[model samples]
Target: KVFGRCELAAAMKRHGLDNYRGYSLGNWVCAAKFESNFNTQATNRNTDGSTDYGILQINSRWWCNDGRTPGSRNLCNIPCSALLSSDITASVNCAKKIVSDGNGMNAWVAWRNRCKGTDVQAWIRGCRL
Candidate 1:
């Protein structure tokens, strides 16, 4: 587990993500919540036989390897387990690199379908970061 809403916001700010790729910190928080509920160990199997890893639910088909999935693009050059660490440095950096790849937050299905343009400011409503 990583954060409550405000703590997550603070962490994001500390990561200089208050406004990366023209997206707000709240957007990231909302996406993270829906994707993993702040659990670093979160992983889900997709119907296509791929798996999503970490807080951002990065796909094994492109981002990392879980051994079960073969021929991963491994664009981040990391093992999938790295994203499951509580430190979050690798996951955050990799997510940023993913956003920089022209997909923006659209790289995340949760952000694209659930959070985008949905008045996500409430994600950081309380808690003293």
Candidate 2:
């Protein structure tokens, strides 16, 4: 599902991304903007051959078990396919556990490069959150 800006933002907040792990909801919104543009089916193949899956692009090598990423830790437990659904439940749940695992918001390069140290407040401006 390709979600609109505010629609995705509000949905994300409803799924617990709001200030999750001390990060701002704007950061989450910003992450979604650059990471996958709120597209639930987005995927990216990493340099190491690991694939990032879904909206937040959870990593196969470190998080989900795609079975393609050799020796994946699969810390999120759910399969990579779980992150691709429109429900956002599996993805959001995995993301929380991931950001909490010492990586924090740094889990996504988009978050560090685009969301962090920037005026992400504009991302959520007038969104009625």
Name the candidate that leads on lDDT.
Answer: 2
The lowest-lDDT stretch of 10 consecutive residues in candidate 1 is 120-129
TM-scores for all candidates: the values are 0.91, 0.95
Instruction: Give stretches of model 2 more than 4 Å off.
Output: none
Worst 10 residues of 2 by lDDT: 69-78
Assess candidate 2 and give its lDDT: 0.88
What's the C-alpha lDDT at position 9 in model 1? 80
Candidate 2 lDDT by residue in tens digits, 1-129: 998888888898898888888987889888988999889999999889999899888899988899888867888888999999998889889989988998688879988988888998788888987
The TM-score between candidate 1 and the true structure equals 0.91
Inter-residue clash pairs, candidate 1: none
Instruction: Give the residue spans of candidate 1 off by over 4 A.
Output: 127-129
